[PDB]
Amino acid sequence: KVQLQESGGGLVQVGGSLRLSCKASGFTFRSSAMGWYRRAPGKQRELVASLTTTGTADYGDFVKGRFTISRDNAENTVDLHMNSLKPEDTAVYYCHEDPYGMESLRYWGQGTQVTV
Amino acid sequence: GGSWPQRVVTKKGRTFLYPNDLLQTNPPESLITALVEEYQNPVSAKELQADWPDMSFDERRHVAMNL
């Protein structure tokens, strides 16, 4: 059964860096997209970063070269290294796995808080 | 009333016999047809057909109910 475990959130004040980590438990589908969305309070859920099994990355507009997304398929994990963080980046960050890169099959993590 | 196994229709109109059609070496034919013609994604169909024998029941159910 797919469980998505998130870790690495928490507070760091402006200009800092964090590593969000997400490990996908269960089946390792031959192709999948993994990434992160965020929800700031009262606002609408946004895509932060995503990466397929082939290796292509997709970033939200606001990222602007600040973030790096990597994946270690051996352990079926994905890590987000965030740099130069700012007050606007404070939100709840949710991990997601999309079997075969399809939103209809998406699993969600429970969400991890990041605070500047 | 009510019986077992049960005919299932999903929120998106997929039909299979539950649980039998999810306990086989091949995925339910409706799901293969859905990926090919509805989504126009034969790649997904080929890959689901390949992963299915190794997929646990929870994951087959997850796919069947949400595809």
Numbering used by the authors:
A (entry chain A): 1 to 116
B (entry chain B): 629 to 695
Sentences from the paper on this structure:
We were unable to co-crystallize sdAb C with NP600 by simple equilibration after mixing or following size exclusion chromatography (SEC) of the complex. We, therefore, used a bait prey strategy to allow facile production and purification of large amounts of pre-formed antibody-antigen complexes. We removed the C-terminal His6 tag from sdAb C (prey), isolating it from crude osmotic shocks using partially purified His6-tagged NP600 (bait), and then employed immobilized metal affinity chromatography (IMAC) followed by SEC to purify the complex which yielded occasional, poorly diffracting small crystals. We repeated the strategy using a trimmed version of NP600 that begins at Trp632 (termed NP632), to avoid potentially flexible regions not visible in the sdAb A or B complex structures, resulting in pure sdAb C/NP632 complex. Within the first screen, two wells with small, irregularly shaped, poorly diffracting crystals were discovered that, upon further optimization, yielded crystals that diffracted satisfactorily. The pivotal CDR3 aromatic residue of each sdAb appears nestled toward helix 2 Asp679 and close to Leu676 plus Val691 borne on helix 1 and Met683 on the turn between helices 1 and 2. sdAb A and B dispose Trp100 almost at right angles to each other while sdAb C employs Tyr100. Since Tyr100 of sdAb C is slightly more toward the open end of the basin, this allows Phe29 to engage Asp679, Met683, and Val691 toward the closed end. While sdAb C also shares the Asp679 salt bridge route (with Arg30), this antibody is highly unusual in employing Lys1 of FR1 to engage Asp686 in a second salt bridge. Perhaps this alternative approach to binding may partially compensate for not employing CDR2, a feature only shared with one other sdAb to date. The distribution of paratope residues of sdAb C appears more concentrated than either sdAb A and B, resembling an oval focusing on the basin interior.
